[PDB]
Amino acid sequence: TYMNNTEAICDVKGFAPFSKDNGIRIGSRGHIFVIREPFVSCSPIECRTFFLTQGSLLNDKHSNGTVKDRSPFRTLMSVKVGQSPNVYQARFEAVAWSATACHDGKKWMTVGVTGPDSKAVAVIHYGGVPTDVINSWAGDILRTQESSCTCIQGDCYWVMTDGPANRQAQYRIYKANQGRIIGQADISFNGGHIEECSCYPNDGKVECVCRDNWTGTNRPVLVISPDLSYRVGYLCAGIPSDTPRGEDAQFTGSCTSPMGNQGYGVKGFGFRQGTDVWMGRTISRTSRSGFEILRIKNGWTQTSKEQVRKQVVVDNLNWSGYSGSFTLPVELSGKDCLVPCFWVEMIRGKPEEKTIWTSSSSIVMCGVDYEIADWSWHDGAILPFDID
Amino acid sequence: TYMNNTEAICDVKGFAPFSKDNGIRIGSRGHIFVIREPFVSCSPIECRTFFLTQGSLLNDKHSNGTVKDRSPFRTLMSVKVGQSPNVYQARFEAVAWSATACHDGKKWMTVGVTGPDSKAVAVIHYGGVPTDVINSWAGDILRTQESSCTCIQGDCYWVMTDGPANRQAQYRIYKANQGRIIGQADISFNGGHIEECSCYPNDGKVECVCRDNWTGTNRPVLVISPDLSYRVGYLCAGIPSDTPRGEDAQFTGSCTSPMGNQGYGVKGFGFRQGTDVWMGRTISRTSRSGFEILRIKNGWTQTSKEQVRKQVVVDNLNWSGYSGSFTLPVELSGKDCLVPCFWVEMIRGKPEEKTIWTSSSSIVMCGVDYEIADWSWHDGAILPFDID
Amino acid sequence: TYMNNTEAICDVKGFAPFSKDNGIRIGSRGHIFVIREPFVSCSPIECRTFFLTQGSLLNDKHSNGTVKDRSPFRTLMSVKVGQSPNVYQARFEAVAWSATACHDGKKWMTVGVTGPDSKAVAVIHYGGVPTDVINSWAGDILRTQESSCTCIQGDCYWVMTDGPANRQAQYRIYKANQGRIIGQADISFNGGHIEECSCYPNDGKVECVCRDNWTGTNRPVLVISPDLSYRVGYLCAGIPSDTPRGEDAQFTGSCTSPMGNQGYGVKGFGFRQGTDVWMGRTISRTSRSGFEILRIKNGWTQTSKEQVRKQVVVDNLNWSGYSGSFTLPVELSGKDCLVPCFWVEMIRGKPEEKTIWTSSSSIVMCGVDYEIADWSWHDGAILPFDID
Amino acid sequence: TYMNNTEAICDVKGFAPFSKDNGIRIGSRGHIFVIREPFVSCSPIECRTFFLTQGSLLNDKHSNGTVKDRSPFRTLMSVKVGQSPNVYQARFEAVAWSATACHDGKKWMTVGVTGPDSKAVAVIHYGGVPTDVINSWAGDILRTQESSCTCIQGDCYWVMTDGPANRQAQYRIYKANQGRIIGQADISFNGGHIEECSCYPNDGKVECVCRDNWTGTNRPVLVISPDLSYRVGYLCAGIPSDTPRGEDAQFTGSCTSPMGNQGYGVKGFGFRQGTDVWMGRTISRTSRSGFEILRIKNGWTQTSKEQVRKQVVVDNLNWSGYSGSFTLPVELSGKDCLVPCFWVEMIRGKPEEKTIWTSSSSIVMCGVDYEIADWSWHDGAILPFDID
Ligand SMILES: CCC(CC)O[C@@H]1CC(C(=O)O)=C[C@H](n2cc(CCCO)nn2)[C@H]1NC(C)=O
Ligand SMILES: CCC(CC)O[C@@H]1CC(C(=O)O)=C[C@H](n2cc(CCCO)nn2)[C@H]1NC(C)=O
Ligand SMILES: CCC(CC)O[C@@H]1CC(C(=O)O)=C[C@H](n2cc(CCCO)nn2)[C@H]1NC(C)=O
Ligand SMILES: CCC(CC)O[C@@H]1CC(C(=O)O)=C[C@H](n2cc(CCCO)nn2)[C@H]1NC(C)=O
Ligand SMILES: [Ca+2]
Ligand SMILES: [Ca+2]
Ligand SMILES: [Ca+2]
Ligand SMILES: [Ca+2]
């Protein structure tokens, strides 16, 4: 039977640890993939950790230059959540240097975007096997979520991006059924910039918090019905949640325009909670260090700065990076609502550390009905390694 | 269908080897987790070995300082009983530096206690996924069994501890249904001290033999009905089974007060056999070396010192440590009673041995209807390793 | 139920990446088999990568002299497609230094040809276990496809070769039911030479594109009905697709005779598309470097040189080698036709590279309904390794 | 449903390769157990390779002194047939320095004999979990088959030995149901010596070819009905099949007395074929080198030396050792008879080779309806290793 994602998001007060794989501590000795862009998505029965291997292993010469973004050695693979991307537990999913994946109830669907920058191709897999394709429509680095896609009653939805990195690109939504694409929509976002959308089910529609790599230090927001009529804009909250951003007092919020004049960005997430919003952001406003998630009273619908709850997952002396969203299916949590959950990627090595390589580990969190104490579940690996 | 644990414990005469993983011999070369606190628990169809990784691997720099108790790299994982905690066979269970886990018939439930000492959080998993939480109630190192919890007809029960290590702490019982907590009880044990309870089903109620880290060299006993009305005290037996303890002749037994004035303690187990009790204790009365289990005529209900049976599992020139309890479900043994079984952890390295690390291996035993010869199935690994 | 392969081949316009295992990059450090002759074949539910281990591992002394073709250490094993032939994921299939394997709907059948050259023996497995045998009939290196066999409604068909390497050998077809051989046919190909046939289902019959190691620089073609009455000849196309071959202008095509007077050859594939043919060939006309696949208007039935479509999978500065065919069962693709798919093997080391060993990696491709951009998904491993 | 082994043994003409694991070639680099006594046994759906680890790994210091026979680090584990005993694929079966295992149709039963020599204990497992026990009855190295036991319609039968190694010991038969022992029989063999019985189903009864470590250079034979009334003696064949033995001409055969006055022995097998017998023996009459199997016309019932068929599996310049029996269940081969199959162990290292360790690999064979060419599928590993 097709899996339900009609339900409302559980209003949550705090987040509790789901997992931590220790891939890089472990990788010092064990056989673990050099990766980046880890993410999570769940089936009726398990939660899995997708990721992009650099086609090589930690502590090996082949991990040299693994800070590069797009190589033909790049693949998408998966493991049981909390397990490290070690060679002997990773399932093959797709060739990809940009990806997304989710479950419709019956099988896994995955999108693998590889190829030359001018002409990338996204290969849709369903049941492990290629089913459909989208070729680059704008000829400049076709790319997508790097976090779980979404499936609401058998049909799956996700967001991609083609175009320049620091100017107006173009944003499309896609809809498929059993690995087969059955619809699409071009997003009208003049003067806006949408990348790496962290989405989730909610009230029967798809809500994504995405990244502005142009000017905004606030995050684009895209709310998608199944008929593909969307509504697009930014996270109302008067608090900047990109990185880099400016200070909180020094920020004016907007549900409509992008705000701040800092370039660049980082992947991040938000969860609408009725009217409030849980937002994640690296602690450091400049560097990809630390992590913390804030509940803001009415920060989704209104430009509020009212932080009702704060919690720290990675402290500021520790590295982090990307973070994103996914939900536990009702068939997994037994809850009458879709538990909000997230994960943080924790990058180590180059460019900041004295290694020939770049990789990352993760900690997954999940929404419980109480406040959880602050702590720092960091990567915790000693650098350099021996290959360095 | 929900699994039965109504049954009576098989009166057993001796214990026969269930398994031995050789993790540290194997770990010299293979990829095995640095761990401690191994334990066992069974499903309708398999027996599994839970454990706490130090988020690192044997023979690796990251195994340095792995004598520490609570790090954020700490996780709970599982394998098939007798298999070593190697990377590629370990399933992820929870983030934990203190834990317990069991099966209700339908899925696995696990409790993962991590966080800062002042404010620990216990994350209940069921079916791999977080379902409920308990925050530290006394602000000092929330902790639990480090041995299998217990599930009697679909509802699961276990014992935790918050408070100081060597004075009056506070002890709670918890009850849950499918990862969801549905009841609790505060244990009244003034002048008593309950830790690391080794429990099991018996006559339809939960019986635990726990650790006194305060003064007692005998072990607390807690007998728990499903309505959460308990009865608490010590193991009547006139023989001390903690470590360190004093000699046997130099010991007065009590079902009520703690006895001996030695501090400290170690995790251990007991099995009520009608009126008698099987008790495990490290051979050495001072050091964590050797192991042996004694049947005492009427040592559960009365303060007897009558050893009807003795058996040695690890000899005194060999290291050991923690030991605990679990049962084979009727759906596994075919017996009309719940076979008593136990395991012994065998610690090696720091603090006693010339290594940068600390870890342990295990041998599981099980109740058969005959006396079994003495022997010593020790860890048997050659120290130091190369990383040392 | 027995699996269908009655259907027609999907007319495809371009091919999109199915997988890439990175075995040799990975093998630098991880535990991967030294292999050659990888290939693919699918079940109702998964696609698997068969291969021939050299009974040893990459970066190990035992990988010395692994350029040899036939050793008693040679075995056939399998993994999930896209996974590398690593020790801990490889299933055992058969002892073989030449092989083929496929699925009939119920279980896997595999043929393992090992033994001395003068008297080889092919062991048919079905369900993992030996079921039937064929002894060498001509006493000179009994051998077969090194690419998936074919199963059409419960009965499986494949092609073997006994005899000299560079003169008239002898070619047989075999037919079996559940690992049991129920028919055979001697192919009459005087002055022709058939080896390493790359086959697939199509319209209810078996079509193979094979290798001419005698004189032809075009490829033998064998079309096989289930009654074992075949029709044999060469690929009409006026373009040479063996290696080595001569130039395209300097080639006269023939559906009947072999063409070119270059000896040797390499394994390769073709897909009939109604009247046109997709053909693969290494880019370099002399060396086993690069790869590319061309659709030729009416090149199957007529001696045409009309290339309607071109696509490059491995560029000419990169190594490749063998390539072959297989299809995705309708029960896997949901398509009303059997998606054509192929894979390319990418050899590295000896004889061309400064290593003591020889091995290879793979990229699998699959037929989609659009043109896919050119690129080069090469092996990408840095040579020599440390063992060298 | 309980599995059938009523059937007759397929009269076979030759044996064809089932598998070869290459454990020691592979072990040079990969993580493989140091072992001995490998053996095979099949379930309705798979064939598995049991073995005795030395609780350590190849190329590791802990493999020192692994020529010893009985250590407490010794365990029994299993893998899919043809797979090597690598850490990450081995299932745990039992603690054992002597063993046997088989399948009754529903679950696996295994016997694990460990402990001190004077008082060994055999732990019966069924479904992975300990179910029954037999204590040493004669106080001198309780031991058993080291090759598959036998299960005929739900009840399982096997043979053990207690007593001295080179004089009269004592031999018992055991019968169990679902890991539970329901019968036993003392074998009357005055002046005879039965060890390491290689058994199999045949006509509804159990037939074993065992080892005489006393005086016989011919092999004891024990034919066992399910009521436990046996008939015991030696293999009639006038050809010696132990090792060491004397020449063939210099041998008088006896179905009754032991023959030859050479001490010692090695494990080996025989298959009754109507009246004839397939017998295996190492080629060298003195050393454990080479292997070959001979069909002898009427060598089971009469003292014949008529070799109708010969076949060589390992040549005489290559090491071998133990060999034993098992059958493919009808539910696996589809044959109306139980295909005879065997395996040969191939020992390497100490005492004969320049290594600190001793271990072995295997090749499994199986009965097909034709003669198979001679060859030598030897271990093929280069010695010493690096640890040496
Ligand atoms: C800075 C450019 C950014 C916005 C378009 O792209 C992502 C930026 C990035 C980041 O860390 O900021 C990650 C994405 N990425 C990284 C990689 C490999 C990282 C290896 O260390 N592959 N994709 C990049 N995406 C792709 C498709 O290349
Ligand atoms: C000595 C303190 C004792 C009583 C409260 O605690 C356990 C004592 C201990 C022992 O060996 O005596 C083990 C428990 N522990 C150890 C570890 C890591 C051990 C790594 O070598 N994590 N928890 C300790 N528990 C926790 C939650 O830290
Ligand atoms: C050049 C001879 C060719 C035509 C008969 O045989 C294949 C040629 C070959 C190739 O690369 O051209 C591969 C086949 N082969 C290779 C190997 C091992 C390769 C180890 O590097 N086993 N079989 C060879 N087949 C066998 C059964 O030995
Ligand atoms: C020479 C004594 C023989 C007859 C009683 O015993 C077997 C002889 C032997 C052999 O190779 O001849 C193998 C059996 N064995 C070996 C081992 C470990 C071998 C490690 O290299 N464990 N049991 C031995 N059995 C046991 C229970 O120790
Ligand atoms: Ca930005
Ligand atoms: Ca104490
Ligand atoms: Ca040719
Ligand atoms: Ca003998």
Of C19, C366, C375, the CB nearest to A72: C375
- Residue A115, SS3? coil
The full length of chain D comes to 388
Whether residues C81 and A135 touch (CB distance < 8 A) is answered with no
Strand, helix or coil for residue A242: coil
Nearest-CA residue for ligand 2 atom 19 is: B69
CA separation for the pair A292, A243 (Å, rounded): 13
* Chain D residues near residue B17 by CB distance under 8 angstroms: 94-95, 112, 114, 121, 123, 130
Q: Is the peptide bond before C44 cis (omega within 30 degrees of 0)?
A: no
| Phi, psi for A198 (deg, rounded to 5) | -100, 110
Identify which of B107, D95, D201 has the alpha carbon closest to the alpha carbon of residue A46: B107
DSSP 8-state secondary structure symbol assigned to residue D2:
P
Flag whether A212 is marked binding.
yes
Structural contact between residues B214 and B166, judged by C-beta atoms closer than 8 angstroms? yes
- Nearest CA residue ID for atom 14, ligand 4: D69
Distance CA A275, CA A256 (A): 17
Resolution of this entry in Å? 2.6
Question: Closest Cα to residue C314, out of C271, C364, C276, C264?
Answer: C364
- Token readout for D210 is 């065992």
Closest CA to A268 of A286, A251, A280: A280
8 Å CB contact between B77 and A86: no
Half-sphere exposure of A242 (CA within 13 A, CB side): 33
Nearest CA in chain A to C386: A61
In whole angstroms, give the CA distance from residue A53 to residue A78: 10
Exposed / middle / buried, residue B144 (Cβ in 10 Å: 0-12, 13-18, 19+): buried
**Burial (CB count within 10 angstroms: exposed 0-12, middle 13-18, buried 19+), residue A203:** exposed
Closest C-alpha to A355, from A85, A66, A70, A68: A66
Query: For residue D32, which of D90, D75, D100, D72 has the smallest C-alpha distance?
Result: D90
Solved with = X-ray
Name which residue sits closest to atom 23 of ligand 4, judged by CA.
Answer: D69
Q: What is the CA radius of gyration of chain B?
A: 19
For residues D96 and D112, what is the distance between their CA atoms, to the nearest angstrom? 5
Task: Give, for ligand 2, the residue of B34, B58, B62, B69 to mutate: max count of ligand atoms closer than 8 Å to Cβ.
Answer: B69
Residues linked to residue B48 through DSSP beta bridges, in sequence order: B41, B80
Answer yes or no: are the C-beta atoms of D194 and D228 closer than 8 Å.
no
Asked if A374's CB is within 8 angstroms of B128's CB, the reply is no
A66 residue type, one letter? T
CA atoms in the 13 A half-sphere facing the CB of D96: 30
Cβ contact A94–C19 (<8 Å): yes
- A128 in contact with B at a CB cutoff of 8 Å? no
CA dihedral B377, B378, B379, B383 (to 10 degrees): -140
| D336–chain C Cβ distance below 8 A for any pair | no
Residue of B nearest to D75 (CA): B20
- C120/D45 CB distance under 8 A: no
For residue C42, give the nearest of C246, C340, C314, C296 by alpha carbon.
Answer: C340
List all residues whose CB is within 6 A of at least one atom of ligand 3. C 36, 66-67, 69-70, 97-98, 141, 143, 165, 195, 213, 358
Distance CA B340, CA B9 (A): 7
Do the Cβ atoms of B17 and D131 come within 8 Å? no
Structure tokens at D287: 């050393």
Residue D262's identity, in one-letter code, is: Q
**Cβ atoms within 10 Å of C203's Cβ, excluding its own:** 11
SS3 A188: coil
Q: How far apart are CA B209 and CA B271, in angstroms?
A: 8
Angle at D78 between CA D277 and CA C130, to 5 degrees: 45
For residue C74, the CA-to-ligand 7 centroid distance in Å is 26
Q: What is the DSSP string of D14-71?
A: EEEEEEE--HHHHHTTS-BEEEEEEEEEE-SS-EEEEEEEEEEETTSGGGTTTT-S--
CB atoms closer than 10 angstroms to residue A181:
16
Gyration radius (Cα) of chain A, Å: 19
Residue at token pair 């360790």: D357
d(CA A257, CA A14): 30
Spell out which residues of chain C touch residue D19, defining contact as CB-CB under 8 Å. Answer: 75, 92, 94-95
Ligand 1 mean position to A299 CA, how many Å?
29
CA of B277 from ligand 6 middle (Å) equals 19
Can you say how many angstroms the Cα of residue B221 is from the centroid of all Cα atoms in its chain?
14
Question: How is residue A141 written in tokens?
Answer: 């680095």
Q: How far is CA B328 from CA B178, C324, D132, in A?
A: 21, 52, 14
Which one, of B352, B368, B343, lies nearest residue B23 by Cα? B343
Fold of D1-388: Neuraminidase (2.120.10)
Distance CA A126, CA D367 (A): 42
Q: Does D387 touch chain C (CB under 8 A)?
A: no
Q: Are C279 and C296 in contact (CB under 8 A)?
A: yes
How far apart, in whole angstroms, are the C-alpha atoms of residue B104 and residue B81?
18
Q: A87 and C370: CB-CB below 8 Å?
A: no
Please choose, from the candidates A64, A46, A47, the residue with its C-alpha nearest in 3D space to the C-alpha of residue A55.
A64
| Burial (Cβ within 10 Å: 0-12, 13-18, ≥19) of residue C326 | buried
| Ligand 3 center to C68 CA (angstroms) | 8
Tell me which chain C residues have a C-beta less than 8 angstroms from the C-beta of D84: 87
Could you tell which of C52, C63, C69 is best to mutate to test the pocket of ligand 3, judged by most ligand atoms within 8 Å of the CB? C69
Please choose, from the candidates D95, D209, A311, D122, the residue with its C-alpha nearest in 3D space to the C-alpha of residue B116.
A311
Question: Scanning the structure block, which residue is given the tokens 């920060």?
Answer: A299
B54-65 per-residue burial string, b: 16 or more CB within 10 A, e: under 16 = bbbbbbbbbbbe
Q: Any idea what DSSP says for residue D109?
A: E
Q: Are the Cβ atoms of D53 and B22 closer than 8 angstroms? A: yes
Retrieve residue D84's tokens. Answer: 């090597």
CA distances to A292, A313, B116, C270 from A372, rounded to whole Å, are 12, 10, 11, 61
HEC string of chain C? CCCCCCCCCCCCCEEEEEEECCHHHHHCCCCEEEEEEEEEEECCCCEEEEEEEEEEECCCHHHCCCCCCCCCCCEEEEEECCCCCECCCCEEEEECCEEEEEECCCCEEEEEEECCHHHCEEEEEECCEEEEEEECCCCCCCECCCCCCEEECCEEEEEEEECCCCCCCEEEEEEEECCEEEEEEEECCCCCCCEEEEEEEECCEEEEEEECCCCCCCCEEEEECCCCCEEEEECCCCCCCCCCCCCCCCCCCCCCCCCCCCCCCCCCCEEEECCEEEEEECCCCCCCEEEEEEEECCCCCCCCCCEEEEEEEEEEEEECCCEEEEECCHHHHCCCCCCEEEEEEEEEECCCCCCCCEEEEEEEEEEECCCCCCCCCCCCCCCCCCCC
DSSP single-letter state for residue A341: E
Question: Is residue D203 a known part of a binding site?
Answer: no
Cβ-based neighbours of B98, under 8 Å, separated by 6 or more = B37, B52, B70, B113, B142, B143, B144, B146
- Asked whether C172 and C184 are in contact (CB, 8 A), the reply is yes
Would you state the structure tokens that stand for residue A364, as one six-digit string? 């997954």
**Is B114:B72 a contact under the CB 8 Å cutoff?**
yes
User: CB atoms < 10 A from the CB of D188, how many?
Assistant: 10
Does the annotation place C288 within a ligand binding site?
yes
Q: Of chain B residues 281-310, which have a CB less than 8 A from chain A?
A: none
Establish how many alpha carbons lie within 13 A of residue D100's alpha carbon, considering only the half-sphere containing its beta carbon.
28
Residue with tokens 């001679």: D374
Q: Are C286 and C244 in contact (CB under 8 A)?
A: yes
Angle in degrees, CA B350, B355, B361, rounded to 5: 65
CA dist C38 and D336 (Å) reads 35
CA B99/CA B147 separation, integer angstroms? 7
Report DSSP letters for D318-387, one per residue.
EE---EEEEE--HHHH--SS--EEEEEEEEEETTTSSSS-EEEEEEEEEEESS------------SS-S-
**Would you call B366 an interface residue with chain D, using a CB distance cutoff of 8 Å?**
yes
- Residue A177: other Cβ atoms inside 10 A: 17
Which residues of chain A from 71 to 110 reach within 8 Å of chain B, CB to CB? 80-84, 86, 88-89
Q: How many CB atoms lie within 10 A of CB D98?
A: 25
Give which of D349, D346, D369 is closest to D358, Cα–Cα: D349
Helix or strand run (H / E) with residue A332: helix A330-333
Nearest CA to ligand 3 atom 6: C165
- Rounded Cα gap, residues B269 and B266, in angstroms: 10
DSSP H or E run through A24 = helix A23-27
Q: Are C266 and C216 in contact, with CB atoms under 8 Å apart?
A: no
Q: Which residue bears the tokens 């309705």?
A: D44
Separation of alpha carbons D102 and D175, rounded Å: 13
Size of interface C-D (CB pairs under 8 A): 123
3-class SS of residue A254: coil
- Residue A251 CA to ligand 5 center (angstroms) comes to 13
Q: How many residues does chain B have?
A: 388
Cα torsion C346, C347, C348, C351 to 10°: value is -160
Paired tokens of A205: 């529609």
Q: Are B122 and B96 in contact (CB under 8 A)?
A: no
Ligand 2 pocket check for B195: Cβ under 6 Å: yes
Interface contact flag, C29 A121, Cβ < 8 Å: no
**Contacts with B299 (C-beta within 8 Å, 6 or more apart), sequence order:** B235, B236, B237, B238, B239, B276, B277, B279, B305, B306
> Which residue is listed with tokens 């020449």?
D247
The pair of structure tokens assigned to B116 is 């800062």
Separation CA B191–CA B181 (nearest Å): 28
Residue A111, Cα to own-chain centre: how many angstroms?
14
In the block, residue with structure tokens 């394709």: A133
Contact A175, A227 (CB under 8 A): no
Q: Of how many residues is chain A composed?
A: 388
Contact between D344 and C141 (Cβ < 8 Å): no
Contact present, C13 and C368 (Cβ < 8 Å): yes
Helix locations, chain B, DSSP H: 23-27, 330-333
D47 contacts in chain C (CB < 8 Å): 128-129
Residue nearest to atom 11 of ligand 4 (CA): D266
Helix or strand holding residue A331 (H, E) = helix A330-333
- C245-264: buried (b, 16+ CB within 10 Å) or exposed (e) per residue? bbeeeebebbeeebbbebeb
CA B99 to chain centre: 10
User: How far from A85 is each of A20, A91, A306, A360, D80, CA to CA, in Å?
Assistant: 12, 9, 39, 10, 25
* Chain D residues with beta carbon closer than 8 angstroms to that of B28: 56-57, 60-62
Across the beta sheet with D155-162, what order do the strands follow? D150-152, D155-162, D170-177, D180-187
User: Cβ(D34)–Cβ(D56) under 8 Å?
Assistant: yes
User: For chain C, how long is the longest CA-to-CA vector?
Assistant: 54
Q: Which residues of D touch B376 (CB under 8 A)?
A: 72
User: B51: which strand partners?
Assistant: B77
Task: List C-alpha distances in Å: D168 to C11, D117, D262.
Answer: 77, 17, 15
B270 vs B278: CA distance, rounded Å? 5
Q: Candidates D69, D144, D213: which one to mutate for ligand 4, based on the most atoms within 8 Å of Cβ?
A: D69
State how far the Cα of D220 lies from the Cα of D217, in Å rounded to an integer.
10
Could you check whether the bond before residue D201 is cis, i.e. omega within 30 degrees of 0? no
Half-sphere exposure (Cβ direction) of B366: Cα atoms closer than 13 Å: 29
| Residues of B with catalytic roles | 69, 322
- Would you say D50 and D77 are in contact if contact means Cβ atoms under 8 Å apart? yes
The CA B263 to ligand 6 mean position distance, Å, reads 5
Nearest alpha carbon to residue C386 among C62, C28, C63, C23: C28
Handedness of CA A23, A29, A30, A34 (dihedral sign): positive
